[PDB]
């Protein structure tokens, strides 16, 4: 199928109306970031010729 980018939401914009939050949610989210790799060393002479 052709993908849907997102659910449709039409914001009710008018020149004299505002929306004010009356409550809140404390949301905890995870972010995973790689920092380092495995430190590898190769003996060039041993690898090519043994």
């Amino acid at each position: 199928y052709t993908m849907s980018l997102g659910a449709e939401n039409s914001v009710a914009y008018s020149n004299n109306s505002i929306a004010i939050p009356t409550n809140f949610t404390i949301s905890v989210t995870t972010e995973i970031l790689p920092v380092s790799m495995t430190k590898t060393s190769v003996d060039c002479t041993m690898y090519i010729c043994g």
Binding site: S17, I18, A19, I20, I26, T30, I32, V35
Partner: protein, 106 residues
Amino acid sequence: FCGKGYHLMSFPQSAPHGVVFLHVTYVPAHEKNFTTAPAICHDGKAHFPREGVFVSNGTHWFVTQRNFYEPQIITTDNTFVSGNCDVVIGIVNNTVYDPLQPELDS
């Protein structure tokens, strides 16, 4: 940069070859409609909120903080006066309470 929502704080956690950030954020919820105006016209003067926004629940005007609904009476302590009512587009008429008024009234 530090999570989805208004960022409050973050926690680091060690991971194999990496770090995991637990982002604690504040998300607004349960929003409600209100009728708003840029300024309040009182005594031929325009009043603007010092830190909040003017909202109306239908009949009465209040000033509240932008990110949470906490209606408070429109007074001279939370508004500032700049100019008359003839320049601002969309100004509405409402009273502005004065805290000093009962003190000299009594």
